[PDB]
């Protein structure tokens, strides 16, 4: 194997952006939070851009609000650094982007359009695109020496890297102006849409295209995506013990390799290290003998053999990933016996990641 050393990465202030990538549901958000907290405890001025924090986690951080903007997290006075946090508001980041490029006056029209409000702001990939936008804003205001980026959940970890350019290309389709705001073919398509779709809706849509007055969206997605290639960017891929999460991690590491983008390593989350050395087979047999003859001793034996089997599966999964990627550093994080919903649990998690 290899040992990922998140501690040295976090402590080194030439690393300005840390992106937590992986499937959804593998521990990205809590991992991002543990990393941002530990970086503050190392003395850095950190902001964590969380996407979907658990209600309780967001409260431990004081960001259970609707703001679309970072707030200081109160930590113990001894702490040399500063932890600030926010939760991406997809719709509000869309509003800010629209105003930034159309201006506040035109923005009142765009923001009032019911097609913008009900369709445009919930298209596929809006969440990745606005995460990248918000990241752009954070970089430009130079309000922090460290930005830790949670990334939105998806069954597909590469969505973070691919959905934004994809959505941009959709927004720049010729079909917007031609079909909503003549030719034999385009005239056919236009007729079809007019005959199938509601008049109110087509009016709102053509209004939206007119007002926005944008290849604008793809160009934005490209510029913002290049930020991920500035010196000082680190990706951390997080995966659970499961085969699916690991496979998404592998896909993602592959893409990072092809693009020569810095991969810090893999966080292999939710493991079950053995605390007792009793072999599995022994464990089973011993319990079966007791089964033939105080239930408690047999049950403890079955707990332990079950855990042992799970550990075997985990070890062989990681061995697969390490075989395919012998160059990728790893840190294994055991499943902790409590929920990660308070600054104290964040501290125990960060202890697991940093060592």
């Amino acid at each position: 194997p290899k040992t990922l050393d998140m501690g040295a990465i976090l402590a080194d202030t030439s690393n300005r952006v840390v992106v937590c990538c992986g499937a959804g549901g593998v521990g990205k958000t809590t991992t991002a939070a543990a990393l941002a907290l530990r970086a503050a405890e190392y003395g850095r001025t950190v902001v964590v851009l969380t996407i979907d924090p658990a209600k309780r986690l967001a409260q431990a951080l004081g960001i259970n609000d609707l703001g679309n903007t970072p707030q200081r997290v109160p930590l113990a006075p001894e702490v040399p650094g500063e932890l600030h946090a926010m939760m991406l508001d997809m719709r509000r980041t869309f509003d800010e982007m629209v105003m930034q490029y159309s201006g506040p006056e035109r923005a009142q029209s765009i923001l009032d359009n019911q097609f913008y409000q009900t369709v445009a702001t919930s298209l596929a990939g809006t969440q990745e695109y606005m995460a990248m936008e918000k990241l752009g804003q954070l970089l430009s205001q130079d309000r922090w020496d460290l930005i830790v980026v949670d990334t939105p959940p998806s069954r597909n970890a590469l969505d973070f890297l691919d959905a934004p350019k994809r959505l941009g290309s959709f927004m720049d389709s010729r079909l917007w102006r031609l079909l909503l705001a003549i030719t034999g073919v385009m005239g056919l398509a236009m007729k079809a849409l007019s005959t199938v779709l509601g008049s109110q809706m087509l009016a709102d849509a053509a209004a939206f295209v007119q007002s926005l007055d944008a290849g604008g969206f793809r160009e934005k997605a490209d510029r913002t995506y290049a930020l991920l290639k500035r010196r000082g960017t680190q990706f951390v891929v997080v995966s659970a013990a499961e085969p699916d999460a690991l496979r998404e991690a592998s896909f993602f590491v592959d893409r990072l390799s092809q693009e020569s983008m810095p991969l810090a390593g893999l966080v292999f989350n939710r493991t079950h290290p053995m605390l007792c050395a009793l072999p599995i087979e022994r464990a089973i047999d011993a319990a079966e003998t007791l089964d033939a003859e105080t239930s408690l001793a047999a049950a403890v034996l079955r707990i332990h053999a079950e855990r042992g089997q799970t550990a075997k599966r985990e070890i062989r999964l990681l061995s697969r990933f390490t075989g395919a990627n012998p160059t990728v550093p790893v840190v294994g994080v055991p499943s902790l016996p409590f929920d990660v919903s308070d600054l104290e649990a964040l501290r125990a998690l960060a202890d697991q990641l940093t060592t």
Binding site: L179, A189, L275, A299
Partner: protein, 330 residues
Amino acid sequence: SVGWPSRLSGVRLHLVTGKGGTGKSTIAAALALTLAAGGRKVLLVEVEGRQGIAQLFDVPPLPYQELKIATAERGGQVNALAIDIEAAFLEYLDMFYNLGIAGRAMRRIGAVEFATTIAPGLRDVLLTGKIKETVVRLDKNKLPVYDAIVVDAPPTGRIARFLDVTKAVSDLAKGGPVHAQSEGVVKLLHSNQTAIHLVTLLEALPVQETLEAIEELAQMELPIGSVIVNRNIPAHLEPQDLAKAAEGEVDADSVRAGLLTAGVKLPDADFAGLLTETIQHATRITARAEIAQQLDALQVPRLELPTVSDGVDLGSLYELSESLAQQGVR
């Protein structure tokens, strides 16, 4: 207390929802197998273009045709329909507006993709309309083509809007035939022909969304079917012992005695590790039971499926179908 009231046996349309990653696709497939046993014919439908059925069965992407994908017990048959929204849109233009020519022109420039993407409501009309068409289709003898239709449905955060036919039709051209068929779709969804099952895991968010989805769907007067708790694990401890272990109390002298009996003596570090191993197990079971308790609020049938220890393969689908069958699903 039963997981499958007899009324669910007369349901013709089963919609399987649940939060992402809880196993909608797996369970919708096992449910289809369960209802297909005994020489019946059931259609398994997915609606999101995700080719999840083909992925589940480890086969290449399925085309827009109903095709036999699995044999059920005693000669039953499960067909698969990965609904293709673009083809469904073309079908719609030709059948209801005789605009097949325009439609085939749109396919050439990517315009059907555009129209389905831009209008969310049209999309849901097409999908729900196709579902209704498969539910009500009759053969040469005026008999139903399918004994049941099982839909791998959109997830809990979208299922209520997905089934919101009135809102879907709101953004379509007024008059014409679409509004005629939409009344029929709403009737089907609100009848005793339909049921929505919600898959959940014993984790906080899947349960929270299960509860919220059940609430939203009851306000719409859509029929709830079962909550299906997926990937259960064995407690291995009796309730009193469990409760004690979740607090750190294990009464080791008893454990040392049991081990001594079993011909095994452990060093003290190993014994301490074994004690820690069962406390953590008990903390996990206790947390799961606490989450589970939140479902007790609903007067909804509850089904339970085990964890398949390795990756879900075809034999696993049959194992899960057997568990449903043993719980009364039929």
